[PDB]
Amino acid sequence: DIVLTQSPASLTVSLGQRATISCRASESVDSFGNSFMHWYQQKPGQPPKLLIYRASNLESGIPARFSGSGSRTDFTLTINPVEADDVATYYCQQSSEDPYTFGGGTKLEIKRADAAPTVSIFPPSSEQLTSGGASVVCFLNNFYPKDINVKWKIDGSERQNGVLNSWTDQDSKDSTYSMSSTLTLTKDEYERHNSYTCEATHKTSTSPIVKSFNRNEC
Amino acid sequence: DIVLTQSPASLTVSLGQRATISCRASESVDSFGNSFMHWYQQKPGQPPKLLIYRASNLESGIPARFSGSGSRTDFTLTINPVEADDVATYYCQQSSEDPYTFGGGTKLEIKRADAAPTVSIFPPSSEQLTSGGASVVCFLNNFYPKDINVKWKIDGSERQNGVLNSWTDQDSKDSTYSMSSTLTLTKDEYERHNSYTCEATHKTSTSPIVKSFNRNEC
Amino acid sequence: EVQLQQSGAELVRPGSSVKISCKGSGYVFSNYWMNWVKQRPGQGLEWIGQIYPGDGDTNYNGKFKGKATLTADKSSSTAYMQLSSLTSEDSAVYFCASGYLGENYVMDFWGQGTSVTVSSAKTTPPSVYPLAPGSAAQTNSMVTLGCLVKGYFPEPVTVTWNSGSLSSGVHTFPAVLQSDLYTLSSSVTVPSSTWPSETVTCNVAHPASSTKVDKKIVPR
Amino acid sequence: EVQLQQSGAELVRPGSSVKISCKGSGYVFSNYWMNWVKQRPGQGLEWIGQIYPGDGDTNYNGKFKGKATLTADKSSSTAYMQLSSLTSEDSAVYFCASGYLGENYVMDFWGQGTSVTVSSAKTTPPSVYPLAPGSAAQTNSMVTLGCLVKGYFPEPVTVTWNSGSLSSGVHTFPAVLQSDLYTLSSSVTVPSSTWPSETVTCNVAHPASSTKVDKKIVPR
Amino acid sequence: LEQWNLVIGFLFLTWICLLQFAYANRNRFLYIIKLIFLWLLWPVTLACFVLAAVYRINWITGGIAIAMACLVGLMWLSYFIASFRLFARTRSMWSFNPETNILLNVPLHGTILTRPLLESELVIGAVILRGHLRIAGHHLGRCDIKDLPKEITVATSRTLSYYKLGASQRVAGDSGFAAYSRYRIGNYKL
Amino acid sequence: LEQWNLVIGFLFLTWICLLQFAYANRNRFLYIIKLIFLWLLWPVTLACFVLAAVYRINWITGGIAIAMACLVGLMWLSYFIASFRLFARTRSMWSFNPETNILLNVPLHGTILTRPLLESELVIGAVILRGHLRIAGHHLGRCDIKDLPKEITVATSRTLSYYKLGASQRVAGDSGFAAYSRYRIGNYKL
């Protein structure tokens, strides 16, 4: 079992600069005159896509901005003009021995300018209230980078129960993120309190963005 | 120009026996290790169909009952189990020199049992009469062999003017012939006489078949 | 499936010129050879020349040099042959053929053929006359029926019975040229119960004069 | 073109067995190899084995011997993989791949993937609640709208807006497992002139329980 | 000296014929004669060198003759070992041909046809061209697309490769194209 | 004889190396050495035979030496004439290789690539196999289906054949198949 080790486990490159990914090997991958080292690209929710086969040859239908090199144990993949569509995870595979093995995986991230979130607060619906639940939902859209915190205070008092956060993948068009935090209550707890505030603390936004509502008018 | 001479110019074989066709040559058709002699089959109203190429090789899609041989100058095509569908004309072609030349052609006839004609006489139509002509038509259908003659006697007197006989090709199903003889008259000449008779004499019957009509009934 | 399709029949005057076409489908047209065979109405076949449409390399018979000119058109996938200073000897049927691997010594698939008529006679529509057994209607086991087509120019004419549904027992006879007008006959036989229970019809189509006749035959 | 198509998502129970299929078109199925890769939900890829459908020659990883059995069917052009004695570690996505020339060392075209879930929890239809902007009506240049899907099992569910016509700035968030019940949300932003002039609709389809909901969004 | 001059004259005449005509695609009679000449030339050279060593001018020539005898013995043993390994792999008489080291075996017409190869390959192509199988440029015989061999092997002295059919294609006129790709290089010998 | 035994010992050692290793695909250095030896063998053999003729035992040996001298001169002239004809028709250094007599010329990448052939063919096939042109089993280089050469030639000492492209085909993965068929065998030399 030729163990393949990749470096680094995560990579951030600005639009335009080059990206270098390395793949090691426990043994020699070179067979009788052939290398047998392949590179794949897998976007979320899709099967892997072959880029380089036998460590040098470029796959048909793949843009010429991907190039690979190396021999024996050291191998390298290079994307010289990176673009916003190259956000994926890259693997290396060997085919010399019978139990084919894959690499660990290297996630590629794109660096760009900082952006501020667009906070939106939503009250519970009548269907939710008559079913018995109370889930207030706050959306944070189109911000960069991923460093963001949310504080779910109610009537001036913080709440640390029932908060579920969910980030999205980095976009392939503008390379920005999104996030939604939901606070789940019951009908009685929602009825008693009046003011609910969603506070988003982003690094570029020194003063946090606040969106709030009162259930008496809603 | 390599002149190709075929023998015979006409062939009659019974349904089941073998047929042999020969093709000569003015010079040697053998190129640097290749023969370059081809055989074709052409049914009436259709383009030629290749059977044998380079004097031995059988064309794909052609039944295996066709086979060719020969070299240098003497070449031969053989159809051992002939069938009723093999009625056509066969040519030989050379491709060694720049002006490609074809053979004379050998028409293949098929022998079978004798049959008698089915005589049918037809009076002139009213449209023909009001247009001004008068053409009586006699049909002879499904007879073998081709040895037949028709006598166009009117009111007991033979007519030798305006008679047109037209044979058909031998059938590919029962291998029998047909013919139609038409006698052309004007309206006044048709109206003068009364009785018209179509008399056909075939070798299989010593007494000719007669079909006649009168203008009084018609 | 590799195929070749030619143009229609051509009627020209002596001293003029005609341009035959033959286009193919199902393969790369620029990598093959075409061979342009000629067959006279009563004689055998005869070879004219070759052309490679990829670059324009041609061979000629030597007899037809000056008479025949071969050109090609890669963009439309169509090849042409032009015959000049036409005479009465130039009436024939012209084929186009090619090989399965694109070779110039074997002709594997052919075109249907193009008929060229060189005469000064003008086109004439046909005149269809029914033929019926007016003597006694011939009430035997099977009654025979005719349909006479007279006085048309040029060849050919197509005679079919009931739009091709009745194609058993049909004998179409060759045309007889007479004073520059052709004459043709065809005969069909039907069971005595079928006629006159169902009305039969001979459909005569003359594409040279765009004449379409559906004359139906009736008892006297 | 060369294609590979797999089955649908499979929900099973521990101790049972499942049979995944993957069939291909556009080529001779008996002359190729298939490679049957596996990808865990939070880990990397892993190789299971091979099969040649022409005669039945197989290779295995060694870890998956006994767990995975590969068979083929030339007549229907379909290959199968059976996993036996399933446990919680066996929940993954299983692919099938082949090479362009029928080789066993390159994987050129893949299958879309088949998700297998090994759990004792029963299927539950989703509950869709609209999210209307009741705080201050969001009367800005671009008003945002939401649609909350809560309590469904198993994965996945698809949320589309106005049957796919509204696809400008649609963010669908990953599901969060909570007491064996997933929860999902999605957001869309429209100009303030469009809504509430035209009421939007979030179409939710759960194929596991055959649930189709077309909940509409109206002002509070 | 005149006797030796005639003998050394005929000695060179055989040397010209072997280097100009004795090849496999060339005169096969002379090819067989060349094989016999080589097989008889090995022991004669070894015996001549050991004789020059035992009857030597001085100790330098003795060492030179001993080294040359060791070299020719090494060549003899290397040839025999390589030829016997290749014959064990393929059981063909091309194993003893010094010009070739890679051999291609194809099961066709109920027999196995052996042909030499210039280079070892990872994928081998095939064409038909009107029902005449032609693998790696070698004219094998008449075959169809349906009747293509399902597995071929390429044997050398050190390893034995296995190839399998894949990616066929048909064109008009009983012609086609196929590919054979390697799947196993172990499992030595037959 | 000890001196002559050493000399005749080294005479056979060169004979072992030329018949076992001196081949074009095996060892190019020994192939060039074999060419030099072959080009030097003819004058030496001719001079030795005429020397045996002038210094002869009897008139029988004189006639034998004269006949052998005529034979080696005939071989020399035949080789030079054939090689010069082939070089005039192909302008390649494979013309002087005694093993080969048929040469294939392919215009690719702005140059002409000469390779030897075993048999003269009426039709020549070609395969691609992932963008790697391979005509008559010879590995030429990288090429596309649309970049195939339009015309190739096959040259020998007596005639020059011309071939043209026809009946191409494409399969998935930048691979394909083509055929080259002969249309002219005249128009000798370039």
Side-chain angles (χ1 to χ4, degrees), chain D residues 2 99-101 103 106 108, chain F residues 129-130 171-175:
Chain D
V2 285
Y100 276 148
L101 294 173
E103 48 245 351
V106 181
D108 288 312
Chain F
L129 297 181
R130 292 180 179 262
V171 303
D174 197 0
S175 305

PDB file of all heavy atoms in Angstrom, chain D residues 2 99-101 103 106 108, chain F residues 129-130 171-175:
ATOM      1  N   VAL D   2     -20.187   8.242 -24.571  1.00  0.00           N
ATOM      2  CA  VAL D   2     -20.051   7.220 -23.540  1.00  0.00           C
ATOM      3  C   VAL D   2     -20.645   7.752 -22.241  1.00  0.00           C
ATOM      4  O   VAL D   2     -20.329   8.866 -21.810  1.00  0.00           O
ATOM      5  CB  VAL D   2     -18.580   6.810 -23.367  1.00  0.00           C
ATOM      6  CG1 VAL D   2     -18.145   5.935 -24.525  1.00  0.00           C
ATOM      7  CG2 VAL D   2     -17.685   8.033 -23.285  1.00  0.00           C
ATOM      8  N   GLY D  99     -12.424   3.662 -18.440  1.00  0.00           N
ATOM      9  CA  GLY D  99     -11.512   4.381 -19.299  1.00  0.00           C
ATOM     10  C   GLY D  99     -12.033   4.499 -20.719  1.00  0.00           C
ATOM     11  O   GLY D  99     -12.942   3.787 -21.127  1.00  0.00           O
ATOM     12  N   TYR D 100     -11.434   5.419 -21.478  1.00  0.00           N
ATOM     13  CA  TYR D 100     -11.915   5.686 -22.831  1.00  0.00           C
ATOM     14  C   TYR D 100     -11.568   4.561 -23.797  1.00  0.00           C
ATOM     15  O   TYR D 100     -12.291   4.349 -24.776  1.00  0.00           O
ATOM     16  CB  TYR D 100     -11.351   7.011 -23.341  1.00  0.00           C
ATOM     17  CG  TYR D 100     -12.150   8.219 -22.911  1.00  0.00           C
ATOM     18  CD1 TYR D 100     -11.531   9.436 -22.676  1.00  0.00           C
ATOM     19  CD2 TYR D 100     -13.524   8.142 -22.744  1.00  0.00           C
ATOM     20  CE1 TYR D 100     -12.256  10.539 -22.285  1.00  0.00           C
ATOM     21  CE2 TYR D 100     -14.257   9.240 -22.356  1.00  0.00           C
ATOM     22  CZ  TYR D 100     -13.618  10.437 -22.125  1.00  0.00           C
ATOM     23  OH  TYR D 100     -14.341  11.538 -21.735  1.00  0.00           O
ATOM     24  N   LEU D 101     -10.475   3.842 -23.554  1.00  0.00           N
ATOM     25  CA  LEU D 101     -10.075   2.719 -24.391  1.00  0.00           C
ATOM     26  C   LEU D 101     -10.344   1.370 -23.734  1.00  0.00           C
ATOM     27  O   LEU D 101      -9.908   0.343 -24.259  1.00  0.00           O
ATOM     28  CB  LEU D 101      -8.596   2.833 -24.760  1.00  0.00           C
ATOM     29  CG  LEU D 101      -8.165   3.996 -25.656  1.00  0.00           C
ATOM     30  CD1 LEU D 101      -6.655   4.047 -25.777  1.00  0.00           C
ATOM     31  CD2 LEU D 101      -8.799   3.885 -27.029  1.00  0.00           C
ATOM     32  N   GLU D 103      -9.392   0.482 -20.506  1.00  0.00           N
ATOM     33  CA  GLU D 103      -8.269   0.108 -19.662  1.00  0.00           C
ATOM     34  C   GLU D 103      -8.673   0.104 -18.190  1.00  0.00           C
ATOM     35  O   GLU D 103      -9.711   0.642 -17.802  1.00  0.00           O
ATOM     36  CB  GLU D 103      -7.094   1.056 -19.891  1.00  0.00           C
ATOM     37  CG  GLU D 103      -7.471   2.523 -19.856  1.00  0.00           C
ATOM     38  CD  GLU D 103      -7.279   3.203 -21.194  1.00  0.00           C
ATOM     39  OE1 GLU D 103      -6.697   2.573 -22.098  1.00  0.00           O
ATOM     40  OE2 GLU D 103      -7.705   4.365 -21.342  1.00  0.00           O
ATOM     41  N   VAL D 106      -6.904   3.790 -15.798  1.00  0.00           N
ATOM     42  CA  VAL D 106      -7.382   5.158 -15.950  1.00  0.00           C
ATOM     43  C   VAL D 106      -8.899   5.160 -15.836  1.00  0.00           C
ATOM     44  O   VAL D 106      -9.575   4.296 -16.406  1.00  0.00           O
ATOM     45  CB  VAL D 106      -6.934   5.777 -17.292  1.00  0.00           C
ATOM     46  CG1 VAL D 106      -7.431   7.200 -17.417  1.00  0.00           C
ATOM     47  CG2 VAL D 106      -5.428   5.755 -17.411  1.00  0.00           C
ATOM     48  N   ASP D 108     -11.829   7.611 -16.805  1.00  0.00           N
ATOM     49  CA  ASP D 108     -12.085   8.789 -17.626  1.00  0.00           C
ATOM     50  C   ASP D 108     -13.500   9.335 -17.472  1.00  0.00           C
ATOM     51  O   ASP D 108     -13.674  10.546 -17.327  1.00  0.00           O
ATOM     52  CB  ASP D 108     -11.807   8.468 -19.097  1.00  0.00           C
ATOM     53  CG  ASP D 108     -10.333   8.316 -19.389  1.00  0.00           C
ATOM     54  OD1 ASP D 108      -9.553   9.190 -18.968  1.00  0.00           O
ATOM     55  OD2 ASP D 108      -9.952   7.321 -20.036  1.00  0.00           O
TER      56      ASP D 108
ATOM     57  N   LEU F 129      -4.848   6.505 -30.918  1.00  0.00           N
ATOM     58  CA  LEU F 129      -4.680   6.018 -29.544  1.00  0.00           C
ATOM     59  C   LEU F 129      -4.201   7.136 -28.608  1.00  0.00           C
ATOM     60  O   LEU F 129      -3.064   7.143 -28.129  1.00  0.00           O
ATOM     61  CB  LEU F 129      -3.729   4.816 -29.493  1.00  0.00           C
ATOM     62  CG  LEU F 129      -4.154   3.551 -30.239  1.00  0.00           C
ATOM     63  CD1 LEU F 129      -3.113   2.467 -30.069  1.00  0.00           C
ATOM     64  CD2 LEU F 129      -5.510   3.070 -29.764  1.00  0.00           C
ATOM     65  N   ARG F 130      -5.096   8.111 -28.407  1.00  0.00           N
ATOM     66  CA  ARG F 130      -4.879   9.253 -27.507  1.00  0.00           C
ATOM     67  C   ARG F 130      -3.785  10.188 -28.030  1.00  0.00           C
ATOM     68  O   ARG F 130      -2.836  10.522 -27.322  1.00  0.00           O
ATOM     69  CB  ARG F 130      -4.562   8.804 -26.075  1.00  0.00           C
ATOM     70  CG  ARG F 130      -5.702   8.147 -25.323  1.00  0.00           C
ATOM     71  CD  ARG F 130      -5.234   7.751 -23.932  1.00  0.00           C
ATOM     72  NE  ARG F 130      -6.279   7.121 -23.136  1.00  0.00           N
ATOM     73  CZ  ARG F 130      -7.015   7.751 -22.230  1.00  0.00           C
ATOM     74  NH1 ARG F 130      -6.856   9.040 -21.985  1.00  0.00           N
ATOM     75  NH2 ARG F 130      -7.930   7.067 -21.551  1.00  0.00           N
ATOM     76  N   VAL F 171     -13.150   8.057 -32.644  1.00  0.00           N
ATOM     77  CA  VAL F 171     -13.725   7.460 -31.449  1.00  0.00           C
ATOM     78  C   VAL F 171     -13.429   8.383 -30.275  1.00  0.00           C
ATOM     79  O   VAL F 171     -12.645   9.328 -30.380  1.00  0.00           O
ATOM     80  CB  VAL F 171     -13.196   6.035 -31.175  1.00  0.00           C
ATOM     81  CG1 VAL F 171     -13.464   5.125 -32.362  1.00  0.00           C
ATOM     82  CG2 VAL F 171     -11.723   6.069 -30.852  1.00  0.00           C
ATOM     83  N   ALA F 172     -14.079   8.105 -29.148  1.00  0.00           N
ATOM     84  CA  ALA F 172     -13.979   8.978 -27.987  1.00  0.00           C
ATOM     85  C   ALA F 172     -12.578   8.948 -27.393  1.00  0.00           C
ATOM     86  O   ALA F 172     -11.928   7.900 -27.339  1.00  0.00           O
ATOM     87  CB  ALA F 172     -15.002   8.572 -26.927  1.00  0.00           C
ATOM     88  N   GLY F 173     -12.114  10.111 -26.944  1.00  0.00           N
ATOM     89  CA  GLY F 173     -10.839  10.204 -26.265  1.00  0.00           C
ATOM     90  C   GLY F 173      -9.668  10.607 -27.128  1.00  0.00           C
ATOM     91  O   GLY F 173      -8.538  10.198 -26.838  1.00  0.00           O
ATOM     92  N   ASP F 174      -9.902  11.406 -28.174  1.00  0.00           N
ATOM     93  CA  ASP F 174      -8.857  11.855 -29.101  1.00  0.00           C
ATOM     94  C   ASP F 174      -8.128  10.665 -29.731  1.00  0.00           C
ATOM     95  O   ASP F 174      -6.899  10.619 -29.791  1.00  0.00           O
ATOM     96  CB  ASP F 174      -7.877  12.807 -28.408  1.00  0.00           C
ATOM     97  CG  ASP F 174      -7.043  13.614 -29.392  1.00  0.00           C
ATOM     98  OD1 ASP F 174      -7.218  13.437 -30.616  1.00  0.00           O
ATOM     99  OD2 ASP F 174      -6.210  14.428 -28.938  1.00  0.00           O
ATOM    100  N   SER F 175      -8.905   9.692 -30.201  1.00  0.00           N
ATOM    101  CA  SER F 175      -8.377   8.511 -30.866  1.00  0.00           C
ATOM    102  C   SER F 175      -9.149   8.281 -32.158  1.00  0.00           C
ATOM    103  O   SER F 175     -10.285   8.734 -32.312  1.00  0.00           O
ATOM    104  CB  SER F 175      -8.463   7.271 -29.968  1.00  0.00           C
ATOM    105  OG  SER F 175      -7.825   7.497 -28.724  1.00  0.00           O
TER     106      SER F 175
END
